[PDB]
Structure formats: structure tokens, C-alpha cells
Design a protein around this ligand. Structure first.
Ligand SMILES: CC(=O)N[C@H]1[C@H]([C@H](O)[C@H](O)CO)OC(C(=O)O)=C[C@@H]1O
Ligand SMILES: CC(=O)N[C@H]1[C@H]([C@H](O)[C@H](O)CO)OC(C(=O)O)=C[C@@H]1O
Ligand SMILES: CC(=O)N[C@H]1[C@H]([C@H](O)[C@H](O)CO)OC(C(=O)O)=C[C@@H]1O
Ligand SMILES: CC(=O)N[C@H]1[C@H]([C@H](O)[C@H](O)CO)OC(C(=O)O)=C[C@@H]1O
Lengths: 387, 387, 387, 387
């Protein structure tokens, strides 16, 4: 049967470690795929870790220019949370250099985008076979979440972008049932930019905190209703959560527009808590190093900067990077609410380190109604490798 | 229960990528079987990739003369589509240096041919155990499809050849239920040659587009009816689809006889679309490089050369090779028709490259009702290896 | 449904080998996690071997300072009994540098402790997802069993310590159902010390034989009743069973207090047999070498030293170490009583051997109503490795 | 439910290849256990290949003196037929340096013998856990079949020996249900010797063709009835089938006594066919090289040497060795009779080859109602290895 996922997100006080794969450290001797963009999504029976491979293995010559982000070898696959993205326990998902996945309660639906930049094709799979397709509608690197999509009562949703990484681009919302596309919407967002949305379900609607790679150091937000009507804007909090970004003291919040003259970014996330908000971010304001999640009072509806909680998951002497959302299915947690969880990607190698390769590891954390002490569950791999 | 597979093939506009294993690139460091002749077949629950191994691994000394095509070590095995033909996720099927496999909806049926060339034995397995046998009837390399066989309402069919690779040979159609042979027919085809048939089910009959290794640059075709009555001939299209072959402008089509003075060939395929036809072929007319599928208007019933669609899957600067058919089970696609899919084998190593070994990789594509942009999902391995 | 586990422990005459993983010997060429603290727990369908990894592999540079006992890479995982703690057959459990696991008959419950020493967090998982948390209550290395916890009629129990490894510490009993904590108790034990309890179910109560790392060479014992009321003390036997320890002839037993001026220890175990007791111990009185289990007449209720049975499992020329309890589920053994079993950890590498690493192997033995001959199923690995 | 296995053996005309693992060739680069004594047994769902490991891997230093036959590292494990005895797809069975396994239709029962030679213990497992034990009754290397045991209507049987490898020894028949021993018998066989029995079920009784390592070049035979009453003797055929052995022309058959002055032997097998018999043997009469099975007219009841069929499976230029029986469950073959199958072990390394190690590979063949052509599915590994 289908996963209702109509409950509201659980109000958490802190997050506890769920897993840590140690992908890279292990890959020193083992046969581990070189990856990037790992993320978590759950079925009502287990949670899996999805990832994009370079079709090559750690400590091998094919892991060379594995920094480019795209190639015809790039593939989407998965293992159960905590397992390294190793070859012998991996499941093939889709041919992709950009993906998103989610389970509706019956089967898994994946979306892998591959093909030429000017005419990429996003193939949708369901139950292990392709079912529908979305062709590039703006001829410029069609891309999606790199995080778990969202399924509410059988219908699954996700966000996609097509256009430049700087100036105005084009964004759309997609909705599907059993792998077949059943609706779509264009998101009007002039002056704003949207990418790599980290979504989760809350009170029957789909909430996402994305990435503005054009001019925003604060993150865009969009509440998608089942009928595809929607509300787009920015995380209200008077604190920036993208990288690169300026100081918090130099940042005035804004619920409607981007702020700060930073034109880059990194995939991040946020969880609504009533009117409050749990927002993650790299400790460093310039580099993808360290990770922390802050809970801002009324930070979801106000330009508030009233911090009530702060928990470090990767200190600032260690590499971090991408991070995304997903929720624990009620059939697994037993709760009456949707337990909010996230993962932190820890990128190793180029561009920051002197190695011919680039891959990443991940740590997973979940909701919990207790204050969790600060610590650093960093990658821990020793570079360079037999390079 | 049994898979009806009585529906008609879906009318597709293009094909989207299903998977890509990256077998060879990965095999640079991992433990991957050296293979050749990979192919896809599906059960109503998953699709698998079958392959013939040399009983050796990539980057190992036993992968030496792995070009001979036959040996007592040659084995048939399988993994789920997209997975590399690796040792730790592989399932044993049959002892074979030539095979074919298909699922009837209840269990898997395989056919592995092994033994001496002058007295080979084809052992039939069902549910994981041998059930019946077919001995060489003409004492000269008994062989079969190297592609998915076909099951319609419980009864599975496949084609076999026995005789020389040049002059006249002998071809037969076999039919079985639950692993037990229940009928067979001799195919009268004087002047014609048949090998490595790529079949699929359409409107209750079994349609195949095979390989004439004697004199045909155009491919033979045979519609097998449940009673084993049949229609044999050649793809009508006024365009040749075998390798080697002459220019399209030098080729007059023919629905009844072989044309062009080329005596070699490569396993290829074709899908009927009403009276139209989707035909695959290597871009190069002499080498096994590049892959493309063309849709010819009335190309299945007329000496037509009216091209309506063309899609490249492996450009001409990359190695290609074998390619075969199979269909997506309705229990997986949800469609009311049989989604036509194919795979392209990308051979690396000898004879074209300077290495002591020879293996291949594969990419899988499926039906889809959209035009898919051209691209190249080539092997990508870097030769030579630690050789 | 739930495992009753209300039966009484079976009265055994000796123990027979169940399995031997050969983790280290195999790890010489294979991809085996570097481990420590392995233990066994069973579901009504299979028994698994749990272990703490260093997030690194044998014969790899990351296995360097793998002697420290704790780190942010330390992870809890499992394989089926007898399998080496290898990467490709491993299941992720929890982020932990100290753990305990048990099955209630429906799902697995694990408890992994990680985080800073002064504020560690123990995360509880159930069915593959975290469900509740226990924060360090005394700010000093929160730790637990490193052995199978105990589930009786749905409710699972385990013991935890928090405080110094020398002087007085703090110990508590925890009880949970379906991953959710439902009760807890503080254990009053002034002058006594408790750690790494090896528990099992007997006559509806939970019996444990733990480790006093403060001043006891004899082991503490605690019978936990379903209501969390309890009885704590020491194994009565007039024979010491911890390491280091003094001679048996210099040891007067004691049911209420620790004896001998040894302040260290090693995880060991004991099984009640009516009023008798099966107690394990390293042959050496100073080093963690050799393993043997002795059955003392009335050794559970009297300062008795009347030995009735002695069986060696690892001779004194070989390395041993940790050892813990667990029981065979009646749904697996068919018995009307709870078959008592144990495992012996065989540590290799530092501190005793000249290698840059430290890991361990294990052998498993079970109840049985026959006298089993002495022998040595030692590790057998050849050190040093390619170091 | 239980497997009846009361049908009679199928009358076969020849045997077709079932599988070939290529364990050693693959082990050149992969992580394959060093093995010996591999054998096949089937459940009503799949057939598995059991084997004894040395707790070490091919191409590793621990594979050194792997010729001794026994050690505390020796372990029994299994994979599905055709898979190499690799580490990542292996299942642990029992601690053993001599074993036997069989499925009764509900669960697997294994018997692993380990421990000191003068007091070995055979531990019996069922459903993955030890259930009963058999201690050495004659204090001299307790041993068993090294081949599939036999289950008829829930009760499983097997044969065991204890005593010298030369002069008189002691043999017994064991019978069990659900892992619990329910009966046993002593086999009176003065002047005769019995070892490594290859049994199968036929007409409701258990038939075995064993090995006389004392003075017999012809093989002993024993028909065990459900009540443990029995008939022991020798394969009547006027042709010897053990190794070493004298010429066929120098051999007068004998149904009651051993013949030829050869005191060694090798595990072999035989299938009754009415009053006829299919008997296997190494081609060489002195070395364990080449394998062939001959069908002798009335060879089961008469000193007959009338050969009606001969099929070679491993030519005489290749190494062979052990071989044993088992039957295909009717739930897998669909037949109304019990399809007789066997496996041939192909030993590589010492004592015949210049390597520091010793292991083996296997090929499996099954019943079939057709004449199968001769061929050689030999090991094929290239020695020495990276030694
Ligand atoms: C489809 C694709 O290439 N996505 C890439 C993404 C993208 O370039 C950016 O979001 C601007 O559009 O950037 C990054 C990145 O580490 O910053 C890696 C992604 O693989
Ligand atoms: C059974 C067998 O050896 N088949 C071989 C096939 C055959 O020789 C040809 O079709 C003429 O009969 O050719 C090829 C090939 O790459 O061209 C590889 C096949 O393994
Ligand atoms: C949580 C933790 O670090 N436990 C460690 C434990 C502990 O130090 C001792 O019991 C005193 O408290 O000691 C040992 C040990 O081999 O002796 C290894 C354990 O990993
Ligand atoms: C338990 C045991 O060691 N069995 C061994 C067996 C035995 O020595 C012989 O049957 C005389 O009893 O011989 C052989 C062998 O290759 O010949 C290998 C077996 O492992």
C-alpha cells in the first residue's frame, strides 16, 4: 500500500547519528565506487543511500578527472544506509549525472538525468524499469535535487531546473504516480534562482529549501501543494546558510528576496518546526568545511536571528559539503509524526586536496527529542592515496 | 502464473537509457569476469543481464587468449541490469560458450551450449536445474541466440543453428514448457543463412531479426507462430544493417533474399512498428564501432529507405558490437503494450586494440514515447590495462 | 510475534563448536574490516555476529592506530555467525565505539554509543532506524555490554556504565520495547565496579556476569527482574575468573564483595546451572591468552571451588581475550530450555604483537548435553602482515 | 513440508553438464577460499556446493601447507552450484575438516567433524544452529562422507567411520530427524573397509558406494533401510573403480569381498540402474587424473564387465580426484523419478604440482535421457600462481 506521509514533521531538540559509511577510508584497500552527491531516502522497510558514480573505483586510474560533475559513465546506484558505496553490495538505479529518488510505499521511483548538456534526458524508473521521460525544456544542463524526492499518498513530487548556473534559469515542479508523470508546473521566480532542492513532507504539503547559485546567500523555499499550486521565496531567518556567504552580522534576513553578493552555493537544507526552523550550513563561510545545524526562533516566518540551539556534526578542521533532507517513515519509527533527518556529504580530494581524484563520504543524523552534544564524525581518510 | 506476452509491441518514438554497467572500467581494479555476448531478459519482477564468461577475471593472466569464442571454461551467468558482470553478485546459469535465456512468469529457463564443436550439447535449465537436452544434429558448432529467448503463455521459444559459418547451414526452431522440449521445426532457408537471432513477442507471435554470416548484409527475419509454423525472409528495408556492409546508396532492398557480397556479420536487431521498423547497426560499415538505430517508414514490409528517425547511442569514435532485443514485461511497465528494448555490447581489447585480452561492456535502452537526443554512452575504459 | 524467552537455561555437560570466522587469516588477502569487541546475538531465524569496526580494512594503512578503542570512525555492524567481518556481506547497525544488540522476535534492536567521552550519546535503533536516545548521565565515557542484550516477552534489557575505569563509577539498567525506552534503574554498588556485562535469560529474569575493573578479580553478578528490581553481587565461586588475577589457591570466594588486588580486567562470562556455574576465563592469569570454561559445583551460590568439568577451547600458547554470552532461541533449537552459548574473541596485533594494527577473530560454542574434548580453535593468522 | 524422496533413481543414458565454478582460475585475482572435498546437495528450491576451507585464500601466504587435510581452521561452508567458493557469497555451515550435508525439505542439516584426532567431535546443525553431537567412539580420526547425506520422508541418514586408514576400522550408520539423532547402527564388515560414502535415495532405501582404503580396488556398497537394517558388500562389477587400481583384465569381480592388492583409494561413486550400474573412476589407474563414468550391464548384481556406455568428463591429461553423488529433488526436475547427478573434484597444486598450496575446483553433471558426447571440462588454472 501507499505511504500516507500526511503527518507533520516532528519537533526535534537535536539530532543523533544514524550511520557513517567510511566510504573513502575503506576504499583505500576495498573496491568502492568513486562517488559524489550521496543522499538518503527511505522505504517503509529500510533506508537506502543513493549516489552518483563516475563508473570507476577508488585507488584506480579511472578515478582521474573525477571532478567534472558530468560524463556518460556517471551512474545512479544505491546501498542500505551506512554501507559504503561498494561494488558488491550496490544496486543499479539509472544512468545519471544528476538524480533524485523516493519510495511511495509500494516501489522505488528514481529519476536519472543523462545525455548532452544542451539536450539532456531525464529518465524516470519505477519498480526497476523506466516508465516515463522528461526532456530538457531549456537546452541547458537539465538537473534535479541530488536528494530524496517526496511521495504523499501515492503521488511523488520533485523539483527540476534547466538554464544557466548564473543569471535567470527555469524551474519546474513535477508530480507522478507509479512512475508515470501526471502533472507539472512552472515556478515563477524572476530575480531568484533555484537548484538542488532538499524536500520533505509536512502537513500534507511538500516543503523544500534549495540553492540560489545566482545571487543568494540565503536559501530559497517552496511549499508545494498536491494540486501543484505553490509558494516560493527565501528562508526568512536573518542568518545566511549558503556557501560562500558573508557574516551573520552583515546579513539582514528576507522572506521574499536573495541577499548578499555571493553568486555561488552548495546544496543545503532546512526543516520547519512550527514557525521555527532547523537550518544547516558549513561552518566556514567560504569553504565547504565543517557542518552545523542551527535552530532559529521564528526563523521560518520572520527575519529572526534568535538562535536557540546549535549542534556541530563536522568541526571546521574537516571537509564537509552537500547536505539534504528526507523523513523516517512512520512504519519504521512508530511515531505519529514525520521524523526529520539529514545527511552530510564529506568531500575529499580535488579541488581542496592534492590528489588526482575527487569523491565523498557521508554521515546520517535523525530527529530525536533530546539535545545531542557537539562532535565531529568527519571522513577521516588519509590523503593522498596510492594515487 | 505465466506471462501472457500476447500484447503487441509499443510504438516508440525514440529510446531512453535504462542502464550502463561500466564493467571494464570498474574491472580495472575490481573483480569482474572477462565476458562477451552480454544480453538482457526480464522476469515480471526484474530484468537481468546475462553473459558468457571465460572463467577468468579482468587484469589477470587468465584473461589471455580470451578471444577464441569457445572453451571448456566458458560459462553462462547473470546479474541484475546495470550491475557489472562481477564475481560477488553473479548467479550461475549454465556451462556454455553460446546461450539464451527467458522467464515464463514463474521461473527462468536457460540454454547453455558446451562440449566439442563436432558434437556439442545444449543443456536446458529451468528453476535452477537442467531439465532437457538438445544434441548437435549436424556436427558443426551447435549454437543459439546469445540473446533473450521468448515466452508466450507458458511456452518458450528460441532459434538454433548447426553447420558452417559460410555456406549453407541448418536452422531449427525450438519450443518448450517448464524446461521440457515440446516441439521443434526445421527452417527451410536455401541460399540463406541464420544466426544469433534477436527475438521479441508481438501480437502473439515470435518475431526475430537475425544474422546471415554467409552472404547477407541485410538481416533475415522470421515470424514464429505458436504451432511452429513460420515465415522466414529478410528485413525488407532498402537499407543494410549488418557489419560489414556496403553503402546504403549501393543497396537495393529485398524482403526475400540476401544482398551485398559481404560474407561476415555481427549480431544485430530490429523491432517491427506496424509496417515500419526500428533497425540498429554499427555506424561504421566495416568495423564494429558506433551504434545507431533508424526507423524506416514501411521498412518491415517494403524495400523502403524512407528514414523518419535516427538516434545515436555510441558515436563512431567508440567501439560497439553485438546488440539484441527483449521486451519489458507488462507487470513492470504497466503499459497495455510490450515496451521494446535493446542493449549494445561495447567490445574492448583484441582484435582492434593492443591488449592480451578481449571483453565487453553494455548499455541498455528502452521504448519510450519521446524523441531522445543523440549521445555516446561508450565503454570509456582506458587501454591497455596492467595487462 | 515476540520471543518469550521465559524458559530456564539448559543444563549442559560441555560445549561444542558452532562456528569460526577466520577473520584475520582471510583478511591477509581479502577485504575484512579491522574489528574488536565481536559478539553473538540471535533472532528466531538466524544468529549474527556483531562487531565494532575502525572504519578501516586489514592490511591497509588506515588500520594503523587501531588500538585506541574509540574514534569517530568506529562503527557497529553485523554478519551471520561464522562469516568474517567482511565488507561485502556486512550490514550497518549503528555509529558506535561501544555497543549491544538483541532481537525480540519481531525486529533487531541495537544500541551504539558514540560522541565525545565527556558527553557521549547512545543511540537506540529498531528495525533499522533510530528510535530513542540515552545521553551520558555522568560525563565520563558512557559505555555498555559489547555483548548481546536480553529480550523477554517483547521487552529488551541491557546494562550501562558511566564513570571512571578505576574508582567508583555509575551503573544503570535499561529496559525497552520496540526501540522505545520504557524504564530504567540505578544500580547501588558502592565499593563495587560493573562493566561489559554478558547477560542471558533464565527463568524469566535477566542474569549477567560482568567485569569489575576497579578491584575485582572475581566477577560481579546481577539478576534483573522484569520490574527492574534487582540483585547485584559477585560470582560466589571460590575461584577467580577475571584477568589479571591471582592464583586460585590464594583466592577465597565471596558472593558479596570483590577480592584480589587486581584493578584491571577483561570481558568474561558465566552461566548458571541450578546452583552450579559454568565460568569462562583466560588460561593465563596475567595475559589475554588461552581460554577455558570450568563448571563449579554450587559455584553460583557458594564460595565453592569444587571443579566438576574443564574444557579448553584455546590453548595457552594462543591469544584469546573477550568472551560473552547469549542463548539459542527455542524456535531454532527445538529444545524446551534455553541453550546457553558463548564466543571467544582472539585478539591479534598490538599490544602483544609487533604490528601497526590490532584486530580480533572469534570462535563460537554452544550448550550441548555431552562432554566435549579439549582443543584449540585459535586464530591462526601469521604475523606480521604486509604491515 | 518434508521431501518424500521415495521414488526410484531415473534410468539415464548419459549425463549433461550442470555447472562449472572455475574456482581456482578465478582465485588467481579474486578472493576465493582455498578448498578441498567440495560436494553437492539440493533443497527443493536450489542446489548448493559445499566445501571445506583452510580458512585461507588462494594466492595468499596462508594457503601454504594446505595439504595436511585437517587443522583447527578447517571450516564447512557453501554457495549455490556453479559459484566459486568465494568469500563474499559464502555461507558458514560448521567447524569441520570432514563434513556431510542434506536438506529434508524444510531445513538444511549439516555435520561437521572437528577437534583432536583421538577425540574428535562431530557437531550436527539444523536450520543454522547446532542440535546434537556424535563424539569419536574409537578415538581415531572420526570422519564422514565428504558428500551429500540422504533424507527420506523427514529422516536423514549418513555414514561415519572411526579407526585406522589401513587395517580394520569401525563404521556406523546414523539417522536423524530435525537435527536430533534418533538411531544408529554398527556395520559389521570384517576384512572390509568403508570411507567417504557417496549415497543417494532409491526405492525408499539409501544406497551408497564407498571407499575401501585398506585392500579394495573395487568399491564397497551398502543399502540402508529406514529401520537401520542393512546390506553391505562390494560393487559386483568385474571392473575396479578405485585409485590406485590394477588393470580391468587382471580384475575378477566380487559382490562380497575386496580385490586387488591396492591399499589406498579415492572418493568415488556409483548409481544403480535396475541391476545395471553407472560407475565413475579416474582414467589413470595410479594417479588422480581424468574422469569417466561407465555403465556396466548387470554390474550391480553380477561380476559383469559388459560395458554399454562410456563418457569422459575430464580427459587423462588433466587432474581429477574426488567425486560424489546426490539427486535432483522432484520439486525441481518435475520428473516422477529421482534424477541422479554427480560432481568431479579437480585438485590442483601439491602433491602433483610445484606450488606451496593445494586446492580444487569442481564440475557438476546430471542424469539426462540422452547420450552425451565426451569432452574435458577440466580446471584450466595456470600454475604456479603468484605463489
Ligand atoms: C548537473 C551538475 O553538473 N550539477 C553540479 C552542480 C551545478 O554545477 C551547480 O549547482 C550550478 O548549476 O555543482 C556541483 C557542485 O559541487 O557545486 C556538483 C553538481 O554535480
Ligand atoms: C558459438 C560461437 O563461437 N559463436 C561466435 C560467433 C560465430 O563464430 C559466428 O556467428 C559465425 O558462426 O562469432 C562471434 C563474433 O564475435 O563474430 C562470437 C561468437 O562467440
Ligand atoms: C568504551 C571503551 O573504550 N571500552 C574499552 C574498555 C574499557 O576501557 C575498560 O572496560 C575500562 O572502562 O577496555 C577495552 C579493553 O580491551 O580492555 C576495550 C574497550 O573498547
Ligand atoms: C578426515 C580426513 O583427514 N580425511 C582425508 C582422507 C583420509 O585420510 C583417507 O580417506 C584415509 O582415511 O584422505 C584424503 C585424501 O585426499 O585421500 C583427504 C581427506 O581430507
Amino acid at each position: 500500500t501507499y505511504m500516507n506521509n500526511t503527518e507533520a514533521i516532528c519537533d526535534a531538540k537535536g539530532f543523533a547519528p544514524f550511520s557513517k559509511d567510511n566510504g573513502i577510508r575503506i576504499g583505500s584497500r576495498g573496491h568502492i565506487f568513486v562517488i559524489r552527491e550521496p543522499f538518503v531516502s527511505c522505504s517503509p522497510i529500510e533506508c537506502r543511500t543513493f549516489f552518483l558514480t563516475q563508473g570507476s573505483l577508488l585507488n584506480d586510474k579511472h578515478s582521474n578527472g573525477t571532478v567534472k560533475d558530468r560524463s556518460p559513465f556517471r551512474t545512479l546506484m544505491s546501498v542500505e544506509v551506512g554501507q559504503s558505496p561498494n561494488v558488491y553490495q550496490a544496486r543499479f538505479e539509472a544512468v545519471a549525472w544528476s538524480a533524485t529518488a523516493c519510495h511511495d510505499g509500494k516501489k522505488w521511483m528514481t529519476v536519472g538525468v543523462t545525455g548532452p548538456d544542451s539536450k539532456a534526458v531525464a529518465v524516470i524508473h519505477y519498480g526497476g524499469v523506466p516508465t516515463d521521460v522528461v526532456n530538457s525544456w531549456a537546452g541547458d544542463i537539465l538537473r534535479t535535487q541530488e536528494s530524496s524526492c517526496t511521495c504523499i499518498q501515492g503521488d511523488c513530487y520533485w523539483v527540476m531546473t534547466d538554464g544557466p548556473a548564473n543569471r535567470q534559469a527555469q524551474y519546474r515542479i513535477y508530480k507522478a504516480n507509479q512512475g508515470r508523470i501526471i502533472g507539472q508546473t512552472d515556478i515563477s521566480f524572476n530575480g531568484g534562482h533555484i537548484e538542488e532542492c532538499s524536500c520533505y513532507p509536512n502537513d500534507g504539503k511538500v516543503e523544500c529549501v534549495c540553492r540560489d547559485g545566482w545571487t543568494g546567500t540565503n536559501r530559497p523555499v517552496l511549499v508545494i501543494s498536491p494540486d501543484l499550486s505553490y509558494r516560493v521565496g527565501y528562508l526568512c531567518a536573518g542568518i545566511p546558510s549558503d556557501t560562500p556567504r558573508g557574516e551573520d552580522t552583515q546579513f539582514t534576513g528576507s522572506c521574499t528576496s536573495p541577499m548578499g553578493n555571493q553568486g555561488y552555493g552548495v546544496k543545503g537544507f532546512g526543516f520547519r518546526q512550527g514557525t521555527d526552523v532547523w537550518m544547516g550550513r558549513t561552518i566556514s563561510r567560504t569553504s565547504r568545511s565543517g557542518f552545523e545545524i542551527l535552530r532559529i526562533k521564528n526563523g521560518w516566518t520572520q527575519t529572526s536571528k534568535e538562535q536557540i540551539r546549535k549542534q556541530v556534526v563536522v568541526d571546521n578542521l574537516n571537509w564537509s559539503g552537500y547536505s539534504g533532507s528526507f523523513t523516517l517513515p512512520v512504519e519504521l519509527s512508530g511515531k505519529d509524526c514525520l521524523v526529520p533527518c539529514f545527511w552530510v556529504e564529506m568531500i575529499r580530494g580535488k579541488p581542496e586536496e592534492k590528489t588526482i581524484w575527487t569523491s565523498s563520504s557521508s554521515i546520517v543524523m535523525c530527529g530525536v527529542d533530546y539535545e545531542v552534544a557537539d562532535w565531529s564524525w568527519h571522513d577521516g581518510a588519509i590523503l593522498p592515496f596510492d594515487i
